[PDB]
From a paper:
OleTJE acts primarily as a H2O2-dependent fatty acid decarboxylase to form terminal alkenes but also hydroxylates a proportion of these substrates to generate α- and β-hydroxylated fatty acids. Crystal structure data show that the active sites of OleTJE and P450 BSβ are very similar, with the carboxylate group of fatty acid substrates being coordinated by a conserved arginine residue (Arg245 in OleTJE, Arg242 in P450 BSβ, and Arg241 in P450 SPα). In this study, we explore further the structure and mechanism of OleTJE by mutating the key active site residues His85, Phe79, and Arg245 and by analyzing their effects on the catalytic properties of this biotechnologically important alkene-producing enzyme.
The H85Q mutant was characterized to establish whether His85 is crucial to OleTJE decarboxylase activity and also because its replacement by Glu85 in P450 BSβ results mainly in fatty acid hydroxylation. Crystals were obtained for both the H85Q and F79A mutant P450s in complex with arachidic acid substrate, as well as for the WT OleTJE in conditions containing formate. Structures for these mutant enzymes were determined to 1.44 Å (WT/formate), 1.80 Å (H85Q/arachidic acid) and 1.95 Å (F79A/arachidic acid). Arachidic acid substrate is bound similarly in both the H85Q and F79A mutants as was previously reported for the WT OleTJE. In contrast, for both OleTJE H85Q/F79A mutant structures, a sixth ligand water molecule is clearly visible. The H85Q mutant was found to generate a product profile very similar to that for the wild type OleTJE for all substrates tested. However, UV-visible binding studies demonstrate that substrate-induced H85Q HS heme accumulation is much lower than in the WT OleTJE in all cases. The similarity in product profiles between WT and H85Q OleTJE suggests that His85 is not crucial for proton transfer to transient heme iron-oxo species to facilitate C–C bond scission and alkene production or that alternative pathway(s) exist in the H85Q mutant. The data appear to rule out a key role for His85 in proton donation to reactive iron-oxo species in OleTJE, and suggest that the system is robust and that alternative protonation pathway(s) may exist.
Author numbering: 4 to 422
Write the structure that this text describes.
């Protein structure tokens, strides 16, 4: 088992970012390697379809307790679905999956569409529009409503900012950092607000619609016959829409892709099924999740080495989505590649891999793709706009992935045939 040197390589991982793991595989000439991080903890980095298949074998890999605690404290919440494994996890995961009906998915589609259409005037009136910011505010509107949570309009900008702080809080991979305290306080504010809504729902003082997250989470009973305690219930209720709001990252990246590859715009407009392919390709190509932590429960034989019991595991998300053998030209943006993708659970893993129901794989992938379809269709078809000189760099050596400027547009004008 080959190794990246030192006693602790955390600073080096942060310096190389999304390119760390691939830099190490190239220079060490291997598909699998160990490194130490987060204070001398050994992690074996696995990649590709075989890496993802093993990482999602529950007989042999633990996820519980493996997330850095500071990231639990800011991004997910204590006792969240991401923190639990086994029967308890499967049971609670089914509640999340139960929201993803045909009707509820068709509703998030309609909400996204209506709100972009309703936002056109505002964007015309602005001197410039930072798409990262504008989209995070619009998606807070979409997400709170889809989840059955009432958010007064005066509070939407605050809530969006709080979510943004939480979403960004994996940047130090669990280390201390300047905004850590502010990040916890943002989370507290959002948990308190949601707990109040769960309490008032259970008390019968408010009446969210049946099939909404707030309704279904407030009333659900676990497999032993118990509802969640109200704080846990608020924490997991946030997990139904904070990551929806995080789609703003992908909205910024999608406008970037359309600007860099103007042929895509035309095809999103003219071509059936293309908005779907474009959305998939934003998720594959652009950086968001670098890797995911786990632990070997037992010795594991893998690609010619033995991973000892008790050692950490890191599934390389960026590496897999950018694997030369899986995608032919992994560093080119080419939506047509999805004409031949066979739907594997183990290659297109930007929001995880494996099985939705028994693994920690994202419950929100359909929603992500639907929002990205409708949002890219809007920007491609419904408005024209200019793109000013600005800093469009996406620095692959810096976690998290952002367009430096946020992606700014100007001179927004609705497309209307008035003849
Ligand atoms: C915006 C981009 C999104 C990204 C990058 C993202 C990424 C991910 C990742 C990496 C995981 C963990 C996979 C694992 O641990 O094996 C995950 C889990 C999760 N995602 Fe997402 N996701 C996004 C959007 C959404 C949306 C829109 C929702 C809900 C509407 C959602 C709900 C969740 C839930 C509930 C889990 C936990 C499932 C579990 O622990 O079993 N995600 N997501
Ligand atoms: C080379 C490695 C050492 C690995 C160390 C382990 C680091 C843990 C990294 C966890 C990063 C998880 C980021 C996931 C972000 C989910 C999308 C955001 C949506 C949401 O708000 O939940």
């Amino acid at each position: 088992l080959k190794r990246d040197k030192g006693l602790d390589n955390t600073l080096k991982v942060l310096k190389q970012g999304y390119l760390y793991t691939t830099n190490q595989r190239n220079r060490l000439n291997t598909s699998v390697f160990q490194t130490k991080a987060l204070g001398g903890k050994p992690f074996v980095v696995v990649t590709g379809k075989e890496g993802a298949e093993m990482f999602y074998n529950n007989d042999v890999v633990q996820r519980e307790g493996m997330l850095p605690k500071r990231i639990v404290n800011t991004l997910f919440g204590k006792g969240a679905i991401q923190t639990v494994d086994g029967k308890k996890h499967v049971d609670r995961k089914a509640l999340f999956m139960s929201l993803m009906t045909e009707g509820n998915l068709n509703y998030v589609r309609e909400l996204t569409r209506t709100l972009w259409h309703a936002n056109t005037q505002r964007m015309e009136s602005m001197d410039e529009v930072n798409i990262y910011r504008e989209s995070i505010v619009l998606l807070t509107k979409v997400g709170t409503r889809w989840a059955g949570v009432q958010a007064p309009p005066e509070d939407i900008e605050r809530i969006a900012t709080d979510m943004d702080i939480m979403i960004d809080s994996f940047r130090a991979l669990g280390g201390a950092f300047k905004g850590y305290k502010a990040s916890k306080e943002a989370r507290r504010r959002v948990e308190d607000w949601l707990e109040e809504q769960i309490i008032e729902t259970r008390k019968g003082n408010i009446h969210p619609p049946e099939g909404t997250a707030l309704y279904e989470f407030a009333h659900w009973e676990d497999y032993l016959g118990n509802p969640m305690d109200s704080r846990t219930c608020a924490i997991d209720l946030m997990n139904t829409f904070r990551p929806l709001i995080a789609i703003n990252r992908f909205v910024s990246f999608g406008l970037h892709a359309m600007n860099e590859n103007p042929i895509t715009r035309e095809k999103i407009k003219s071509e059936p099924d293309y908005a779907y392919k474009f959305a998939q390709e934003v998720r594959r190509y652009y950086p968001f999740v670098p890797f995911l932590p786990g632990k070997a429960k037992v010795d594991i034989d893998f690609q010619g080495v033995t991973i000892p019991a008790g050692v950490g595991l890191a599934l390389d998300v960026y590496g897999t989505t950018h694997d030369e053998s899986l995608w032919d030209d992994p560093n080119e943006f080419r939506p047509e590649r999805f004409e031949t993708w066979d739907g594997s659970p183990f290659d297109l893993i930007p929001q995880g891999g494996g099985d939705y129901w028994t693994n920690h794989r994202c419950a929100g992938e359909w929603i992500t793709v639907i929002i990205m379809e409708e949002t890219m269709k809007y920007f491609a078809e419904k408005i024209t706009y200019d793109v000013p000189e600005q800093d469009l760099e996406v620095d692959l050596n810096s976690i998290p992935g952002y367009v430096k400027s946020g992606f700014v547009i100007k001179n927004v004008r609705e497309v209307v045939d008035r003849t």
